[PDB]
Design a protein around this ligand. Structure first.
Ligand SMILES: [Cl-]
Ligand SMILES: [Cl-]
Ligand SMILES: [Cl-]
Ligand SMILES: [Cl-]
Ligand SMILES: [Cl-]
Length: 169
């Protein structure tokens, strides 16, 4: 299974390159950066496939910053990885938070990745080097914009639930 990591590092782009995410606000497609972030992609892809993100919410939405998700509890405190509890960052000089639509791991400081991630809504150079960029929205950014338009509470939670219904490969 670190063999599985080393394999999809190479073959990921052509054998399992895209995931479609269906939300109650529409569907979008992400492109996984297997070569640069192979451990992070294997986790995300595996979690998607086994239905781990099914019926989970975007528990924060902050316009001009990020949509944040991937917590089965919906609180912002939970999440797990296919590797057990937490796993290392994969920081790559070649990947930076340069525009909207980038998927990056949310975390609690260095090497505390589990299943929470952001989708960026603007350039965020201040995150470069602290969060693992591993994919980007490759189809239908409108859906991301619709999600960012929904009203939120003072702690940035959407006033009604915004959720991943399921994932497709
Ligand atoms: Cl790749
Ligand atoms: Cl926004
Ligand atoms: Cl942008
Ligand atoms: Cl956070
Ligand atoms: Cl906070």
């Amino acid at each position: 299974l670190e063999e599985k990591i080393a394999y999809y590092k190479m073959k990921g782009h052509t054998e399992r390159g895209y995931i479609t995410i269906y939300t109650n606000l529409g569907d979008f497609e992400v492109e996984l950066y297997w070569y640069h972030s192979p451990k992070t992609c294997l986790n995300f892809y595996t979690l998607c496939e086994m239905g781990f993100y099914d019926n989970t919410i975007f528990h924060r939405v902050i316009p001009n910053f990020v949509i944040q998700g991937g917590d089965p509890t919906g609180t912002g405190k939970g999440g797990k990885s296919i590797y057990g509890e937490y796993f290392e960052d994969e920081i790559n000089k070649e990947l930076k938070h340069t525009g909207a639509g980038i998927l990056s791991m949310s975390n609690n400081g260095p090497n505390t990745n589990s299943s929470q991630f952001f989708i960026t809504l603007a350039p965020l150079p201040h995150l470069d080097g602290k969060h693992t960029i591993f994919a980007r929205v490759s189809k239908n950014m409108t859906c991301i914009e619709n999600i960012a338009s929904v009203q939120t509470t003072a702690t940035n939670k959407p006033i009604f639930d915004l959720k991943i219904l399921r994932t497709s490969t």
